[PDB]
Short mmCIF file of C-alpha atoms in Angstrom, two decimals:
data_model
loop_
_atom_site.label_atom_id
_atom_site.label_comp_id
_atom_site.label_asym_id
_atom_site.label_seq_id
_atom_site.Cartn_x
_atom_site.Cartn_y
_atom_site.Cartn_z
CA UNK A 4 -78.07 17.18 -51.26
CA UNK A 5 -80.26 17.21 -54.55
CA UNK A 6 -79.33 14.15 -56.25
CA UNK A 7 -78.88 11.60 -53.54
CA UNK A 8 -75.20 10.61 -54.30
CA UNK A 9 -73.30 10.05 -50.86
CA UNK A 10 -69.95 10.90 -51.32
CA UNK A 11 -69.09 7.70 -49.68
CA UNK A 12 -70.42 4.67 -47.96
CA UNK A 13 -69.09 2.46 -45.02
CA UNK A 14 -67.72 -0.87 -46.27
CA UNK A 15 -69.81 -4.13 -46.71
CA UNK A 16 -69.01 -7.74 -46.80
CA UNK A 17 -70.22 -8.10 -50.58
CA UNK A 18 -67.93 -5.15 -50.98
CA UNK A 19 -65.16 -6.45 -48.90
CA UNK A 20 -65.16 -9.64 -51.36
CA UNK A 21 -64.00 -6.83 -53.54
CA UNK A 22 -61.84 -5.12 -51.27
CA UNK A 23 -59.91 -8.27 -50.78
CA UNK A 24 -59.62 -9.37 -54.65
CA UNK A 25 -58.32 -5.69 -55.32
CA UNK A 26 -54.35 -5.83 -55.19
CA UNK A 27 -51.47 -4.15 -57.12
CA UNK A 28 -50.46 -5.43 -60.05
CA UNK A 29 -47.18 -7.77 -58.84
CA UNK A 30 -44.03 -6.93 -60.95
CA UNK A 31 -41.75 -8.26 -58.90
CA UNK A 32 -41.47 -11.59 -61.25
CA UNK A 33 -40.93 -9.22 -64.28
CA UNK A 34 -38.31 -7.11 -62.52
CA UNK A 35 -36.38 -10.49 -61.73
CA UNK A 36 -36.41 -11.28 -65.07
CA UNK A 37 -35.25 -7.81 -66.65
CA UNK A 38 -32.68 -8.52 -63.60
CA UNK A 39 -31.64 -11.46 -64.56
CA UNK A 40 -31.50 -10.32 -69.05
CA UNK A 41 -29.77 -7.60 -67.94
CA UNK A 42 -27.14 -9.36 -66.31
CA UNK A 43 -26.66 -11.76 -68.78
CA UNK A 44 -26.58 -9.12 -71.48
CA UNK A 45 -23.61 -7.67 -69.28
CA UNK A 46 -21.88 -10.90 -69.38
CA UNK A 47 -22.33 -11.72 -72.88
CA UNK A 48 -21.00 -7.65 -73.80
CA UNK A 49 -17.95 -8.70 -71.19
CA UNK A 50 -16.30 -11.49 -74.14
CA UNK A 51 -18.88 -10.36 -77.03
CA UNK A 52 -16.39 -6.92 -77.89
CA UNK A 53 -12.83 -8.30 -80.07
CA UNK A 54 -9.97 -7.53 -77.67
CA UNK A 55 -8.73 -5.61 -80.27
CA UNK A 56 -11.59 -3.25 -80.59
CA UNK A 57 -11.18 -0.33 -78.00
CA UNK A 58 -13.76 2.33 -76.92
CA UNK A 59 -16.68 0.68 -75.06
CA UNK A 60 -16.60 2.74 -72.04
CA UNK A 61 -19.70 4.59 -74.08
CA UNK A 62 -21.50 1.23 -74.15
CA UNK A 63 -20.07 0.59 -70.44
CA UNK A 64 -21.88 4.57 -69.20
CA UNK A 65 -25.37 3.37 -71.20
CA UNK A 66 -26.14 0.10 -69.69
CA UNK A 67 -24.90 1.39 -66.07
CA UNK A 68 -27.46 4.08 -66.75
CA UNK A 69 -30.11 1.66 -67.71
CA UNK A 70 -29.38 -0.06 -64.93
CA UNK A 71 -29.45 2.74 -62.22
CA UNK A 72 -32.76 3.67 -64.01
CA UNK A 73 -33.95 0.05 -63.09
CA UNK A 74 -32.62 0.39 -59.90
CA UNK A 75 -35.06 3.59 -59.22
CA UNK A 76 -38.02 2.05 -60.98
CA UNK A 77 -37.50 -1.15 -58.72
CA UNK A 78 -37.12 1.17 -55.57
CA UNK A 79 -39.93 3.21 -56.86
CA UNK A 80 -42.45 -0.35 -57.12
CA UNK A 81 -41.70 -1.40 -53.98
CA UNK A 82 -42.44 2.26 -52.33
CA UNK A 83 -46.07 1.55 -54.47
CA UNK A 84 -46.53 -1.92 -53.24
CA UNK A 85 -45.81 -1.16 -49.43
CA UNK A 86 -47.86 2.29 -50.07
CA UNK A 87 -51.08 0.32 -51.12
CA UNK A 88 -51.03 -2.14 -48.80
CA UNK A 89 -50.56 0.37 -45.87
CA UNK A 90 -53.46 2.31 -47.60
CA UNK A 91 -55.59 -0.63 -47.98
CA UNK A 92 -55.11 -1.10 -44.22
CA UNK A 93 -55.84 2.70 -43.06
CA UNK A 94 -58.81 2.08 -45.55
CA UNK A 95 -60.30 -1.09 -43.67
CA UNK A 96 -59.32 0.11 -40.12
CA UNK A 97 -61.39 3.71 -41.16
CA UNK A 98 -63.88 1.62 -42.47
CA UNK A 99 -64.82 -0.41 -39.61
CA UNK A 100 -64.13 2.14 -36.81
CA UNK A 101 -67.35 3.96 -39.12
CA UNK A 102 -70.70 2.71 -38.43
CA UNK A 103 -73.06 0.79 -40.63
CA UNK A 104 -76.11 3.33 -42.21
CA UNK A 105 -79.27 0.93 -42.17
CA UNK A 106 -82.38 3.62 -41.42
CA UNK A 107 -81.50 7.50 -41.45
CA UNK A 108 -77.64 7.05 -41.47
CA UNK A 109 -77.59 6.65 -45.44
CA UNK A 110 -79.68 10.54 -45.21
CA UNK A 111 -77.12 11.85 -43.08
CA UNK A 112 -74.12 10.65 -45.47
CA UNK A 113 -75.89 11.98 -48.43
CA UNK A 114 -76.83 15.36 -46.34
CA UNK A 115 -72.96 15.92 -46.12
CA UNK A 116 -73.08 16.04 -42.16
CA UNK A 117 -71.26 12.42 -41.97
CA UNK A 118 -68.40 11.47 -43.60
CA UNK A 119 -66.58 8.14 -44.80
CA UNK A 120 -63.43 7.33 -45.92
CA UNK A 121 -62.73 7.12 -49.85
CA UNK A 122 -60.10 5.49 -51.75
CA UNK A 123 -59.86 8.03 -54.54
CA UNK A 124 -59.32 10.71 -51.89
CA UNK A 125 -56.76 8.82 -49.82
CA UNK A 126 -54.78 7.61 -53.07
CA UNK A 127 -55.00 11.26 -54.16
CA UNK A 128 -53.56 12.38 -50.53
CA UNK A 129 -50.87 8.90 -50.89
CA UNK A 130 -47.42 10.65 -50.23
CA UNK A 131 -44.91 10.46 -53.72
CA UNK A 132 -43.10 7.55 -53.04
CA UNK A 133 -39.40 8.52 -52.08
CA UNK A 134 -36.00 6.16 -53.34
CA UNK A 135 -34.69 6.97 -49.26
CA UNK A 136 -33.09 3.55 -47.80
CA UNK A 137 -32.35 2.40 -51.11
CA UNK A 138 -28.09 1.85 -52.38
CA UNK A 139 -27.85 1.27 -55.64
CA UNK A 140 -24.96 -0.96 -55.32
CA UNK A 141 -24.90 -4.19 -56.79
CA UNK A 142 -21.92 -6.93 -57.11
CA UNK A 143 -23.24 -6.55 -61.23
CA UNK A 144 -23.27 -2.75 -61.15
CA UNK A 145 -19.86 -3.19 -59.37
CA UNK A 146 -18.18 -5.80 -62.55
CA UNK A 147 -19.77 -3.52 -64.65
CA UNK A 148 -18.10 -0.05 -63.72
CA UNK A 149 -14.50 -2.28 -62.90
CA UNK A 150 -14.98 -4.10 -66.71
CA UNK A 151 -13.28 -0.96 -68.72
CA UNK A 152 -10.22 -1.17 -66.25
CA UNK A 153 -9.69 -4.92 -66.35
CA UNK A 154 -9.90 -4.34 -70.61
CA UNK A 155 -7.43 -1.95 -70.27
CA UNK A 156 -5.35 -3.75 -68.00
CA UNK A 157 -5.57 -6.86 -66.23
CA UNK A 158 -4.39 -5.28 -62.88
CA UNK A 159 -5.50 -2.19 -61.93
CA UNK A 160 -7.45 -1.18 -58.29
CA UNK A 161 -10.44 0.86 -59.03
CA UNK A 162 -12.36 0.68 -55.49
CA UNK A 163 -11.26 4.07 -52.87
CA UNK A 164 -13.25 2.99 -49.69
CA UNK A 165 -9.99 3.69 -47.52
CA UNK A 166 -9.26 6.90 -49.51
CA UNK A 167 -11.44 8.81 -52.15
CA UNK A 168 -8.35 9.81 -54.28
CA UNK A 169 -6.65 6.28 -54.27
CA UNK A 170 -5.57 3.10 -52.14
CA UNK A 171 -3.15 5.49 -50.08
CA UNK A 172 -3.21 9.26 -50.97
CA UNK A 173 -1.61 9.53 -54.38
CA UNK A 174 0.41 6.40 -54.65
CA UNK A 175 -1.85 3.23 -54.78
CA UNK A 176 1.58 1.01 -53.97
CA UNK A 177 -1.02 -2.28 -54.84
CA UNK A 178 1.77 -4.23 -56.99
CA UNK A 179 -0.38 -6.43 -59.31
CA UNK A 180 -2.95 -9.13 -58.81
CA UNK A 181 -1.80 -12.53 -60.25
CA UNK A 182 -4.32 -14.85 -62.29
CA UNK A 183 -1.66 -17.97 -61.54
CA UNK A 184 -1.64 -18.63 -57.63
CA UNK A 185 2.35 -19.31 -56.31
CA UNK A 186 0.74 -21.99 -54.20
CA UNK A 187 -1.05 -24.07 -57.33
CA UNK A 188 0.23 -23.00 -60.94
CA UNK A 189 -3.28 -22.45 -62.94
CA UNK A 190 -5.70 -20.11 -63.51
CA UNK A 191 -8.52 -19.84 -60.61
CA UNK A 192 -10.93 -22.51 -61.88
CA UNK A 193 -13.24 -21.68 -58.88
CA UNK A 194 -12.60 -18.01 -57.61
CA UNK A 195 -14.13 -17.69 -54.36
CA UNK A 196 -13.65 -14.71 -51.89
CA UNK A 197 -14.62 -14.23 -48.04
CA UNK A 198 -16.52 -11.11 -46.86
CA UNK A 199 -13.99 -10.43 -44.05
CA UNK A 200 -11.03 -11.21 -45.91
CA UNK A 201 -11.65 -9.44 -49.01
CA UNK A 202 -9.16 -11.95 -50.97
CA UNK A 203 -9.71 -14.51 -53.94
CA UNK A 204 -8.44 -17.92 -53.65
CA UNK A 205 -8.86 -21.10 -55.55
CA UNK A 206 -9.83 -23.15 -53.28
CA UNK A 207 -8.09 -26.33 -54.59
CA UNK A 208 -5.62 -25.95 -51.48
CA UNK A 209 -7.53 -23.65 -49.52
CA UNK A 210 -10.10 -26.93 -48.77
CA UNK A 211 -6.70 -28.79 -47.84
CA UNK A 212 -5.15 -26.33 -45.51
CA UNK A 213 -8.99 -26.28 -44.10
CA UNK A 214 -9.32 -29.85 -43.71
CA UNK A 215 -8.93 -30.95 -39.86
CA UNK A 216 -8.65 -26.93 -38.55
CA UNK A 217 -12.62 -25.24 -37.61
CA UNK A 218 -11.08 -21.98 -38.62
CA UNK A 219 -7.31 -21.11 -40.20
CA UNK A 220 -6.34 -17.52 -40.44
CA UNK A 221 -5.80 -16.16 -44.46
CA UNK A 222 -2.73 -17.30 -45.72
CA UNK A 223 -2.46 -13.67 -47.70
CA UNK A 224 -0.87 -10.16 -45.54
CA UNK A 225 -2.51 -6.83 -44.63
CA UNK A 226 -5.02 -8.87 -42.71
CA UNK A 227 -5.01 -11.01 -40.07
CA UNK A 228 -8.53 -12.93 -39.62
CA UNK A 229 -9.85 -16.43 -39.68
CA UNK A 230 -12.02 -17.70 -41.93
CA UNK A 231 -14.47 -21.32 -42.13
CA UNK A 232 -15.15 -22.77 -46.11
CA UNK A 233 -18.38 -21.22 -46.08
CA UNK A 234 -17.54 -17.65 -45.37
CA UNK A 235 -16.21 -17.71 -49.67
CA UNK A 236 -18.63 -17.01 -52.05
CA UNK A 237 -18.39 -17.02 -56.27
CA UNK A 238 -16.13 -14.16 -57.01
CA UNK A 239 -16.97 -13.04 -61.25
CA UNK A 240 -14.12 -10.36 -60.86
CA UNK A 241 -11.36 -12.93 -60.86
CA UNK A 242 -13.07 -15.11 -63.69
CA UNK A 243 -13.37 -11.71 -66.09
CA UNK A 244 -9.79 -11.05 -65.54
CA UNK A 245 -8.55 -14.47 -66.25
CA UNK A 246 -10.92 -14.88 -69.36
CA UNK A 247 -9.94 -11.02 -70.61
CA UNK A 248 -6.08 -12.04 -70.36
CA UNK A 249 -6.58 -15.53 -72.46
CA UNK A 250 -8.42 -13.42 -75.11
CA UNK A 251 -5.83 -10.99 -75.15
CA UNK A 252 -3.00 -13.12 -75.04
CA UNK A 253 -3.88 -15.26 -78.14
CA UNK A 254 -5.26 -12.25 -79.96
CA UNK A 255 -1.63 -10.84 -79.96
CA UNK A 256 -0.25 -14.20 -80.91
CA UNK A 257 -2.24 -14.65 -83.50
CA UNK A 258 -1.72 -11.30 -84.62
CA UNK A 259 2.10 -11.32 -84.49
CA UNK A 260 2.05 -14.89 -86.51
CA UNK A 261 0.00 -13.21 -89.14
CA UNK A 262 2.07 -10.63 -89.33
CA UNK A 263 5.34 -12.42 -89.66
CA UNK A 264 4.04 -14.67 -92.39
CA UNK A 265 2.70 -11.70 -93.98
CA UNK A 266 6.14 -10.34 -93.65
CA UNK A 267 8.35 -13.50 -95.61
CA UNK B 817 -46.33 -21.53 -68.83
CA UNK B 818 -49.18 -24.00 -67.74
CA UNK B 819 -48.08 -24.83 -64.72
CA UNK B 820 -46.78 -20.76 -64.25
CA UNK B 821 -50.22 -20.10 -65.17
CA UNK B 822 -51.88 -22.09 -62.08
CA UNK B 823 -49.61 -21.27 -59.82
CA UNK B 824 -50.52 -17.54 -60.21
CA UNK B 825 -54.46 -18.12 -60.63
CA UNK B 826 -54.24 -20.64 -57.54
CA UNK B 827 -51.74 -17.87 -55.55
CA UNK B 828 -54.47 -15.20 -56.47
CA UNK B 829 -57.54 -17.44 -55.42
CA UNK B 830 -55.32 -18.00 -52.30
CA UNK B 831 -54.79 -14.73 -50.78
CA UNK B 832 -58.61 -13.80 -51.97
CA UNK B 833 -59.93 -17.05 -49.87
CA UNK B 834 -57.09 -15.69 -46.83
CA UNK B 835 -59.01 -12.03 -47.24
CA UNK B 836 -62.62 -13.91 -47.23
CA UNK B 837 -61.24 -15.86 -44.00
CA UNK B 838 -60.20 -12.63 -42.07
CA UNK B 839 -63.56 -10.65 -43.57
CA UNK B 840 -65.43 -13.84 -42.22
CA UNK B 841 -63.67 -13.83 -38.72
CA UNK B 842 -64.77 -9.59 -39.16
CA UNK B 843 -68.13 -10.81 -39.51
CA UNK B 844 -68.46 -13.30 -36.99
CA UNK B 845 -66.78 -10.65 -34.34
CA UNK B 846 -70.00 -8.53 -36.04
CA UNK B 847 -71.97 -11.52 -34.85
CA UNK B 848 -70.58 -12.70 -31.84
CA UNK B 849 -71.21 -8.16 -30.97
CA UNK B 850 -74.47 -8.59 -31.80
CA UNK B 851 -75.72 -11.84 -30.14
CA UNK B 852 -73.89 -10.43 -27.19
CA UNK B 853 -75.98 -6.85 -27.48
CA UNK B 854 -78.90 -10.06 -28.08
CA UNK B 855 -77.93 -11.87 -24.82
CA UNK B 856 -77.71 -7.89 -23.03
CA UNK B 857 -81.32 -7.68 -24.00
CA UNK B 858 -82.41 -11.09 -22.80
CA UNK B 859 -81.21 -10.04 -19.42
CA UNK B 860 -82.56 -7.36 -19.18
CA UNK B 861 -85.93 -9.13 -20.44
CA UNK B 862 -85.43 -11.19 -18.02
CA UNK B 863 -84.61 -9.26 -14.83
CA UNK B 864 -87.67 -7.64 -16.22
CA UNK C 293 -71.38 -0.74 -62.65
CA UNK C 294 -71.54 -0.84 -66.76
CA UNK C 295 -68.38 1.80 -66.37
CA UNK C 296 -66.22 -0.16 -63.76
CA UNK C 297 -67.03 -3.25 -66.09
CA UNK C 298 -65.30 -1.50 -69.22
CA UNK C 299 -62.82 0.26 -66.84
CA UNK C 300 -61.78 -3.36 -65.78
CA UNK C 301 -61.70 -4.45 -69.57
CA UNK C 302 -59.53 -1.89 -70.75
CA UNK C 303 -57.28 -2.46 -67.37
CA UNK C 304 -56.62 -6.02 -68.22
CA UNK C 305 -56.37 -4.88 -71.83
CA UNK C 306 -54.18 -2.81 -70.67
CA UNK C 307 -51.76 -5.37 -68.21
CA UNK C 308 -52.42 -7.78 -71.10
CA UNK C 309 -50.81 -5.47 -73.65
CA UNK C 310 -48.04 -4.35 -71.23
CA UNK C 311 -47.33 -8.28 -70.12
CA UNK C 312 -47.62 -9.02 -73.83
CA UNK C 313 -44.97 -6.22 -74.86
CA UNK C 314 -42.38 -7.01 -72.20
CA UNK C 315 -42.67 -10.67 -73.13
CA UNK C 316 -41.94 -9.48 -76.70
CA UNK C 317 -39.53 -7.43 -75.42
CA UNK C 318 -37.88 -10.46 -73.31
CA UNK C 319 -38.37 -12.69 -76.42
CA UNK C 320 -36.57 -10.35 -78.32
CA UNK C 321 -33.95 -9.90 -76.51
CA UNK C 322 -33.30 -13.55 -75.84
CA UNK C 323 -33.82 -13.87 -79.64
CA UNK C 324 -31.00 -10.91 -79.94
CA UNK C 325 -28.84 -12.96 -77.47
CA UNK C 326 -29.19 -16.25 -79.51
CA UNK C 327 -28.17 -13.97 -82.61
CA UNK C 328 -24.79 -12.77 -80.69
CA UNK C 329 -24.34 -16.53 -79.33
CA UNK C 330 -24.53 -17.66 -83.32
CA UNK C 331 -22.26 -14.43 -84.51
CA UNK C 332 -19.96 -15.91 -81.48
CA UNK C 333 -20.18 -19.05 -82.70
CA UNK C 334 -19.20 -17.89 -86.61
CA UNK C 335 -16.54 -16.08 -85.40
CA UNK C 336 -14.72 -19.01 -82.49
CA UNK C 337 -15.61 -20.84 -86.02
CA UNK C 338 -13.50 -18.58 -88.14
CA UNK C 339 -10.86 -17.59 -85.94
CA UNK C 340 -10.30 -21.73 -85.73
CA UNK C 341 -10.57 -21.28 -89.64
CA UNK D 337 -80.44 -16.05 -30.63
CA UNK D 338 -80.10 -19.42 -31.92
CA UNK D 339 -80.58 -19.08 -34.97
CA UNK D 340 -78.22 -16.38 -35.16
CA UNK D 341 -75.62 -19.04 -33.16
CA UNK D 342 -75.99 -21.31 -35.19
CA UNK D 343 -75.13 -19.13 -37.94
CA UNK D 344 -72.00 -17.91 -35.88
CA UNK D 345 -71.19 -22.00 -35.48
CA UNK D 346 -71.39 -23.08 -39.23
CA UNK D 347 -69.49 -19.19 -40.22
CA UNK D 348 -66.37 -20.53 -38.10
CA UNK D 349 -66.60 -24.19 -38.92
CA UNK D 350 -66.43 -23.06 -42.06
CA UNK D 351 -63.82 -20.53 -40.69
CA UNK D 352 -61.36 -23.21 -39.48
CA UNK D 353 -61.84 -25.85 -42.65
CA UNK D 354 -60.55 -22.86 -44.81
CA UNK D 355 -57.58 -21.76 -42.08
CA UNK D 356 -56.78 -25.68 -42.61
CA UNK D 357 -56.83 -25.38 -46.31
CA UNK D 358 -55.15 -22.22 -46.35
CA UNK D 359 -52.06 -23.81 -44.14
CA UNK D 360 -52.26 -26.78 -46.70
CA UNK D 361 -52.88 -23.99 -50.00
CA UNK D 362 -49.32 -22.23 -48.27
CA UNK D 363 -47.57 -25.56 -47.97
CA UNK D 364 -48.70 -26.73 -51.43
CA UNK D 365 -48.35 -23.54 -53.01
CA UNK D 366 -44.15 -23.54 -51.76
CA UNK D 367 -44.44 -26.96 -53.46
CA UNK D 368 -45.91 -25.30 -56.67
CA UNK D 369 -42.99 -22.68 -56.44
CA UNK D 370 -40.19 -25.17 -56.05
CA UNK D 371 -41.93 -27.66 -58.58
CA UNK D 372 -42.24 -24.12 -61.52
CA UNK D 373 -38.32 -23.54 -60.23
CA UNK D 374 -37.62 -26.77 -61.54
CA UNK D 375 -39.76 -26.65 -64.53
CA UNK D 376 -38.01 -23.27 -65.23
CA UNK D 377 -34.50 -24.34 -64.87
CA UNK D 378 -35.17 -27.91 -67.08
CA UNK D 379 -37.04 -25.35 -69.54
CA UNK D 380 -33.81 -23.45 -69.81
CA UNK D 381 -31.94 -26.55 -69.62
CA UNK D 382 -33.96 -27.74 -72.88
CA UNK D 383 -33.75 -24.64 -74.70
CA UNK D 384 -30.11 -24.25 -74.39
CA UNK E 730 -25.96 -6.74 -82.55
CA UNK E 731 -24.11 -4.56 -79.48
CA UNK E 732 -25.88 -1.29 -80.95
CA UNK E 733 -29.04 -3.15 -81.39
CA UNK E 734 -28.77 -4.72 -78.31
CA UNK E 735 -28.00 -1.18 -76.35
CA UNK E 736 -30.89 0.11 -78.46
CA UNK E 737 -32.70 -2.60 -76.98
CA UNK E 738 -31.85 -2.26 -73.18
CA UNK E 739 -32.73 1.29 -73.88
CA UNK E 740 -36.46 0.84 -75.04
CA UNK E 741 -36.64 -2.19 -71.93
CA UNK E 742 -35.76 0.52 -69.84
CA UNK E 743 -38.57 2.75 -71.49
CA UNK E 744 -40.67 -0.19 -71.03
CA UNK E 745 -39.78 -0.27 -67.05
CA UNK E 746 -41.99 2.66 -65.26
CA UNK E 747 -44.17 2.72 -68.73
CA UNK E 748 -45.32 -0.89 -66.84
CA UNK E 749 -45.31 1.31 -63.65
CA UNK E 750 -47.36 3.78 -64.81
CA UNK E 751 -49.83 0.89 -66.29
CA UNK E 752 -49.98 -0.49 -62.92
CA UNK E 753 -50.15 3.05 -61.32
CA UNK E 754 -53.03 3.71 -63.94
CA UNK E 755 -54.49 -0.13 -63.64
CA UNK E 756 -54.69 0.21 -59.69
CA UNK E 757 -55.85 4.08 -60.08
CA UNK E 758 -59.43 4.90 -61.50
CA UNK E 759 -60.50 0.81 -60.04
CA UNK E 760 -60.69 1.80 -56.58
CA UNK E 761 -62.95 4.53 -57.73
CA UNK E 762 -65.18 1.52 -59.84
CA UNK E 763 -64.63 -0.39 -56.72
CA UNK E 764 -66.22 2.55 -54.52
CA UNK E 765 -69.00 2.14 -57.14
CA UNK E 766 -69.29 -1.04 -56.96
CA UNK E 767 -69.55 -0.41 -52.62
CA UNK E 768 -72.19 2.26 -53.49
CA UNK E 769 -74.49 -0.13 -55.53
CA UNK E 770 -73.30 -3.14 -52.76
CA UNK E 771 -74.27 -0.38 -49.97
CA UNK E 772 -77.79 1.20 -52.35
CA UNK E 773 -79.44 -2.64 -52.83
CA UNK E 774 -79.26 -3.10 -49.13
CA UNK E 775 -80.48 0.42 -48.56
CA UNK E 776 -83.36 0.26 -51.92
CA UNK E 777 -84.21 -3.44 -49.92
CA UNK E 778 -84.66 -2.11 -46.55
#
């Protein structure tokens, strides 16, 4: 009508050159990497702090907002990516079921009687992408929300899968988690845990007691399961409470030697 | 950063060339439609 | 065509700048993290002192 | 019709020499990834 | 350093969906040049014939 502007076109080779160049910009290397800074950030806040400073469950709240907000952005790119490419794909299939205008077809288009599919006006119609299917649970988010407990207090048992209020009802009755093992007498220089078993071990007589048996069931109680050497995986929980009670144990001796110097 | 730098012009190039091969194999099914509406007319030229 | 040509420019401008910032931002923050990691290292330093 | 054949012949040689370089591209490019992993981790290696 | 480094995670995480939004804006507003650029593709072939 009047100016002859179609108000679209079927697709052509020279344009599907184009078609096939065009792609969303990829973020997924930068969101690794804010990932991965993040992360380390947490770790380096976990000893940065002086064990005797208190009051960094404000800092703790900020950065496990910042993360949940990178969480949702993440969630939020890959809704985009997997949105574009499905559009891209209605696009080409709409565009090839249409036929090619060579003679009169190109008239009709312009005329308004025929009709072909447009990017604008499918990105336009694009459903919001939704954050559905996505937990924002990570074993960092998890270190990070447990961190202000283990400063307080080496032992404590913040998770309530079994029970919202606590371990059992009111009364957690969990004792207290040791850094030295009964079995070896050190701190856990490798602290690995199994999924099924839940439970952090050394591993420096865990291999032994594994050595010649496929599976042995864990040596610990309220389970009874058996586990192979590859089931464990790095545990940082048990490594932040060991590190946490060295700090804090030679802050308050070198506090109390101060002190009783300063005293004579 | 060089060799991050090719990898992502060459990854690029890559899936454009894969999207040329599968716009190719769309135009020789274009083609392979049309010598066969081609062939439909020879036959009928030649039952003719 | 003239259009999508500067539309393109100020696109990559555009990732160019963002890329550019969030390196910055990365570099800064790694910078930042070297800072702490020398403060850390003054202050093992002085509590050995 | 021959012409147009002939045309549909050289489009999928062509066709199949990129498929082949596009196997060898993905195996090279997995190379490429592996070989910037590296680079990345000796990078962080030399700046620590 | 912690503050500035808090500060810091807070303008990365400004940064984060500001990069989204580039992209959103980057990918947006081309496939419109890129229907343009089909129109002229499409208007050559149909000026030619």
């Amino acid at each position: 009508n009047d100016n002859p502007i179609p108000k679209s076109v079927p697709l052509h080779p020279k344009s599907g050159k184009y078609f096939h160049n065009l792609h969303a910009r990829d973020l997924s290397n930068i969101y690794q990497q804010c990932y991965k800074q993040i992360d380390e950030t947490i770790n380096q806040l976990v000893d940065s702090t002086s064990p005797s400073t208190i009051g960094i469950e404000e800092q703790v709240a900020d950065i496990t907002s910042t993360y949940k907000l990178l969480s949702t952005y993440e969630s939020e790119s890959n809704s985009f990516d997997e949105h574009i490419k499905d559009l891209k794909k209605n696009f080409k299939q709409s565009s090839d079921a249409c036929p090619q205008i060579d003679l009169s077809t190109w008239d009709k288009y312009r005329t308004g009687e025929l009709t072909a599919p447009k990017l604008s006006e499918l990105y336009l119609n694009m459903p919001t992408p939704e954050p559905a299917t996505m937990v924002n649970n990570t074993d960092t988010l998890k270190i990070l929300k447990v961190l202000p407990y283990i400063w307080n207090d080496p032992t404590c048992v913040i998770p309530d899968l079994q029970n919202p209020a606590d371990e059992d009802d009111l009364q957690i009755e969990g004792g207290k988690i040791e850094l030295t093992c009964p079995i070896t007498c050190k701190p856990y220089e490798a602290p690995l845990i199994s999924r099924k078993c839940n439970h952090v071990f050394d591993r420096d007589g865990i291999q032994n007691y594994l050595q010649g048996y496929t599976t042995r069931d864990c040596p610990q109680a309220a389970c009874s399961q058996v586990v192979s050497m590859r089931d464990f995986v790095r545990d940082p929980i048990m490594e932040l409470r060991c590190k946490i009670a060295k700090m804090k144990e030679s802050q308050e001796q070198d506090k109390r030697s101060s002190q009783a110097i300063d005293v004579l | 950063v060089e060799a991050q730098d090719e990898l992502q012009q060459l990854k690029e190039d890559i899936n454009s060339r894969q999207s040329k091969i599968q716009k190719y194999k769309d135009d020789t099914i274009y083609y392979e439609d049309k010598k066969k509406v081609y062939l439909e007319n020879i036959k009928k030229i030649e039952v003719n | 065509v003239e259009e999508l040509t500067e539309k393109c420019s100020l696109k990559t401008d555009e990732f160019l700048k963002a890329k550019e910032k969030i390196n910055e931002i990365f570099e800064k923050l790694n910078t930042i993290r070297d800072e702490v990691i020398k403060k850390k290292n003054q202050n093992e330093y002085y509590r050995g002192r | 019709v021959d012409e147009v054949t002939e045309k549909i012949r050289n489009r999928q040689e062509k066709i199949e020499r990129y498929t082949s370089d596009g196997t060898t591209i993905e195996a090279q490019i997995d190379a490429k990834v592996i070989y910037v992993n590296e680079k990345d981790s000796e990078h962080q290696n030399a700046r620590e | 350093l912690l503050l500035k480094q808090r500060h810091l995670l807070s303008k990365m995480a400004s940064s984060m969906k500001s990069l989204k939004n580039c992209q959103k804006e980057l990918i947006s507003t081309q496939i419109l040049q890129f229907e343009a650029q089909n129109m002229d593709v499409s208007m050559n072939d149909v000026i030619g014939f």
